[PDB]
Amino acid sequence: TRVTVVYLMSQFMPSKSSLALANIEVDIGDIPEGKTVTIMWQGKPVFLRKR
Amino acid sequence: NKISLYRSYSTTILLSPAYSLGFCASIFIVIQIISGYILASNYIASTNESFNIIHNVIMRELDTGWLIRFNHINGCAFLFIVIYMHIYRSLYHNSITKTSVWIVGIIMYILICGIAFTGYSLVYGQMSLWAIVVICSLVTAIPFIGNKLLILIWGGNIVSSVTLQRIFCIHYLLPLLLILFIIIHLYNLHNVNSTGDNYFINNRYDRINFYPLLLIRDVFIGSNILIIYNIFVYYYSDLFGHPDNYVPANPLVTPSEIMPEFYLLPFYALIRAIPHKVLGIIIMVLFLLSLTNLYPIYFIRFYNNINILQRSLLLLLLLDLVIASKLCLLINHYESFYLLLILSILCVLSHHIYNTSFNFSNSI
Amino acid sequence: NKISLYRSYSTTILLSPAYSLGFCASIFIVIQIISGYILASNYIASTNESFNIIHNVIMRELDTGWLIRFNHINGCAFLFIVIYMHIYRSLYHNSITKTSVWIVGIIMYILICGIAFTGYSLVYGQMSLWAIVVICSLVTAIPFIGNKLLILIWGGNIVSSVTLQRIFCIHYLLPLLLILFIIIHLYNLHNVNSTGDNYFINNRYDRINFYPLLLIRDVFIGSNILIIYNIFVYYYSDLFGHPDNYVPANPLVTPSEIMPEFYLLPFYALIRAIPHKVLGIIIMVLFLLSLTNLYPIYFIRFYNNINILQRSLLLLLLLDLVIASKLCLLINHYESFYLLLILSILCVLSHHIYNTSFNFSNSI
Amino acid sequence: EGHSAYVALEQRVNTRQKGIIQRHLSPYDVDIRGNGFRQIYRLGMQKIRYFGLIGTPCLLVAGAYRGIWVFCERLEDERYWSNAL
Amino acid sequence: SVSELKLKFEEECAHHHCHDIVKKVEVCEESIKGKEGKNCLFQHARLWECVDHCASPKVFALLK
Amino acid sequence: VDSHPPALPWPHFQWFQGLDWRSVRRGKEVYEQVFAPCHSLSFIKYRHFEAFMSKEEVKNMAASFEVDDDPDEKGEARKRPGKRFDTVVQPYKNEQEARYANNGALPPDLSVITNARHGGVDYIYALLTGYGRPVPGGVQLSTTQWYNPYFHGGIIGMPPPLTDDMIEYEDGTPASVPQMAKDVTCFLEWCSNPWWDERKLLGYKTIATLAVIAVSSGYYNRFLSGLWRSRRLAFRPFNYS
Amino acid sequence: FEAFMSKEEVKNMAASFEVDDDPDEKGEARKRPGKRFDTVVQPYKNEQE
Amino acid sequence: MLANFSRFFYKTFLQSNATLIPLTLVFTYXXXXXXXXXXXXXXXXXXXXXXXXXXXXXXXXXXXXXXXXX
């Protein structure tokens, strides 16, 4: 019963694909001081600024 | 044996036309079931092509898919109107004494609220998306599991096609459980009979055959109610809706005002009048649980009569609920109305449905 | 009152392990309901996304979506196997005397055949599409209103997305009506009780309490049959299927051999063995209607006992049905098997279930 | 249970019972192995005899069908091997 | 290479376990000469089904 | 009817045994170097290869290709190196294009191929190692048709895809035609059923647990039946002359 | 538009525009004149544009 | 047989649900969930070890390193 409940519930967890786009990493050693760079992440464009 | 059909069940002569509200509610349940089954046979649940197939395929390619959709919307609205009148009548005539009928009714009310919410979600418009977002954010306040549970419910960090598919399946399933609970509702009522205008213990010589007199009365009242209902399906088809739901949902853009359907506003008010999220959730659960009559269980309790004071306070309850809904939606631009919203909510939370004989006793 | 729980229902002591087939069928109905509800929460019905959303989303994006799908498939197959064993036992022990139970069971059997067919239609593969086409070609043979009827069934001249969506709604809806019919089945049985190995009229001193002995026996037999079931789920997942259903549907190409699932093959045989399409339709309808016990109604009929000749003939009926299924599949290439196909079908149609006491009478 | 069709039947048909004595042992005083091998043997023999009886017509008809099946199968093999299709 | 061994095994199996099928397919080859619309696809399919029953597994055991 | 594929002992058709994963690696190599341009794997993504390949190897393999990106700020189309989450590259733009590059034939998608053919893995093996046989009499073969006795009808539009020493395996195993056929069949078995080992393992666990439950419940049923299996009856006699 | 216009006028209006067609023999892309059953022409390729 | 042991065992564990329930939970965990399940898992992993995915990945990294040195 325990494993069956856990398994039926696990059918409702996030899909592996959604777990692949959730985390991304950017290289901050490329942007110089005072420059803002735009990237893509989960559709919403993201600004990285060297404040 | 036609005679045996007439005498199968008998009731009191004091059934005013106000006792057809259950029949009207059943009519609108039937209309909802049929129109929803017709809609679901043309529906695809997915963020890509949900809003499109409602507005471009169902409405504009079928002969009267528009009429089906309008029937469904206004049937939900009128089902809630009739249920509210039904509850108000049952409170007026002290029908809390029909314990089993009342408890099944409250369960059915909760189910129908859930059905309405999950249905409104399926139109992947701006209002649907952001109502889901707000409700699920209220889910996030539970101690020690708000984020795990929220992720499980949504299937991710964001509403998506899997969320739409879950909602579609739940919306399809729940109304059938609702039909079963309606059957149980009527079974209990037949077991304990009806109250009428006044309560009397009548022998068989003072009761009348249910059929066909009350069936014909039900037909008459249902005909009038359907006239009133069709005056809205054909001439005010979006009076109960919000125009922002005719905009395809943008997860990046939030609407100016997020207002639920008019039959959920009271609940929304409870959320807005309680600054603490956990306290708001607790108050919501306690409210829904206190509408029932599950305690005391083994202590001896019985119900006495109802009086003019209680009926006047019932009118006050109605007033407070309506004002609370309106104010809850107004407070987004006008901060001074918080006083009146809180006052109305407080007045609602302290309304006596059952006068407890335990108010009077002595001390050891 | 635990004692009152024990004695609420009593049965005979002659319930051999063969009388747990109803419980096994209940287990598989539960499995199908749960698996189907989980699948539907991830399913989109269309000709552009259906096949893809099963093999690319359900079975590869979830942790054990493949396991859920295999459960659904093999649970359908084993439900049919157990139901056939249930029917065979009912015929062996002359359980047609339980008139209410038998009629409800036949209704449930027809409903389950419909559910299985509509579900198999949802995998928009080659076999699904072409089975739909063949069955509908059977439909269009109705005199007068056939062609129009077909259009209404398909919503067009071909199988399309709307066809898949209505099939999905039907597949979702029907199993719940099946649940209600199972409840009625059990209610009637508890009204008339179980036959057992032999029929006796027992007073309360000769009967035993149902709970918990028969529940424990049901658990034991259910665990054994679940072992057998799971052997197929994990190691023979595709044994009860045709590989051509893993090819996405191609309306321009017909498969070499169109064959239905093993549990519908007998019906298919009844169509291959009757050259005239209208005659085949009529004979299928008469076959289904004749499995029931709805005639005579107001003529006095009662049931006698069953004997060894009848049991041997029942075994012969099983043999003939199996042979007919295999031959109706084999006739596509080899035309000399029509002789044995027709012989087996004629033998099946001439099997006596109820021994007509009217066989013997005198003329005026 | 008192309002059931089988209870009604037993009340209509059977008399008011009298003079019946039943003895039951608690399962804690009964050995599960007590009558195991004897019952296994007896039931196996009974089922062997009974299935030998009621299975004979099916066996005979299956033999006839096997003859027909062999004939048709080899006829069709001969047809295919000679391009007579 | 394993391909040469495969061809050798196929020849051995054809001439030692499907000799009757070989004779039959040779017989049917003569029959279709001149006839219009006739082919030996079925007979050759039977031959190559018989041959691979014995030849194919052996080769399958010689590869990693 | 066509030739029935022989039944061969595959390592994953054995007791307590699963996919080889060495055959799967080598079959991935053969897929990359042979039939990547002709056939497609619509259901396989680069991150799926992180089962027999290392994370960095998968990352480099993904970056080796180009994928469509979101349109430019002016709406212009773009290309972008692939990532883990992107589906492998399609070989053809649309079916017509495919049919034009294969002389009217359309190479099917091989994502579930072993599940889509009768006797799947064997069939595929029997299909690939069956191309050089003599053509039967009375059969007319075009310039783009070949005789394969295992294909439906005996004539196929796929040129013999495998030749000896065509691919240089990384682990040094010689790439003969039967070896490469075995490796691609194992790789396609993995593609069709990427859950083989987990399925077998869950099967063993579930059967064991159900067996425990069955033994215990059978004992308890036998115990409870003891009350009735030993019941005794006695009838008080009448007074008869 | 065949609700306040005539069939011929709607046919000419539809034919006045160019609608994407199914690819040709060699793949690629084709465009064909509009017809009654075609949707009205979009003004932009994609949201960014 | 084992009369004294039977009495002791019954009086200790089986007489009360306050101890029988913990006993059955212990049996569930230590003798079913980490004894049959995990044991079959380990056995499966051990039999099929020369063909393991881990083994394949390790050999692959080794060969890649060896090729990179040329």
Ligand code: HEC
């Ligand atoms: C020259 C391009 C090309 C290459 C390289 C190629 N194929 Fe094919 N393949 C085709 C075409 C074209 C077809 C379609 C055959 C038909 O339908 O007649 C096909 C058909 C198939 C089929 C379908 C057989 C059936 O029964 O329908 C399979 C399986 C297959 N190929 C596997 C492979 C494998 C494995 C490889 C790598 C060894 C491969 N192919 C290499 C072009 C190719």
Ligand code: HEM
């Ligand atoms: C099984 C019966 C039902 C089915 C299959 C069903 C199905 C659907 C479907 C597919 C939709 C989306 C299509 C659309 O939005 O127009 C929908 C919307 C909706 N349903 Fe139902 N429904 C059922 C019963 C009910 C019931 C009983 C209610 C209760 C009032 C209800 C309330 C709603 C609401 C409020 C909406 C959204 C209204 C809107 O479109 O703006 N449905 N339903």
Ligand code: HEM
């Ligand atoms: C689906 C919505 C509902 C339907 C279809 C429904 C239907 C009915 C019907 C047919 C009756 C008997 C006829 C009548 O007296 O009007 C009835 C009576 C009653 N219902 Fe409902 N009902 C619904 C919701 C509710 C709710 C939410 C409650 C609140 C607890 C409720 C409480 C009662 C009571 C107390 C009675 C008996 C009143 C009396 O005779 O004194 N019902 N209902």
Ligand code: HEM
């Ligand atoms: C409400 C309950 C059920 C729901 C919601 C449901 C839903 C679904 C869905 C969405 C599919 C398509 C997904 C897939 O093919 O894997 C499906 C397939 C299927 N269902 Fe159900 N189902 C239900 C009950 C049943 C029952 C009772 C049966 C009969 C035993 C059944 C038999 C099938 C079959 C045979 C298939 C196709 C098998 C295949 O994919 O090859 N379903 N069902």
Ligand code: HEM
């Ligand atoms: C979903 C499929 C079915 C389920 C779940 C089901 C369930 C049950 C159950 C639980 C019982 C009582 C336990 C037993 O005696 O085995 C039963 C008895 C019975 N069923 Fe069904 N049944 C199904 C299909 C059928 C069908 C198709 C028939 C054929 C008309 C049928 C005829 C009977 C009869 C005659 C009995 C009583 C036998 C007797 O005690 O003499 N059932 N069924």
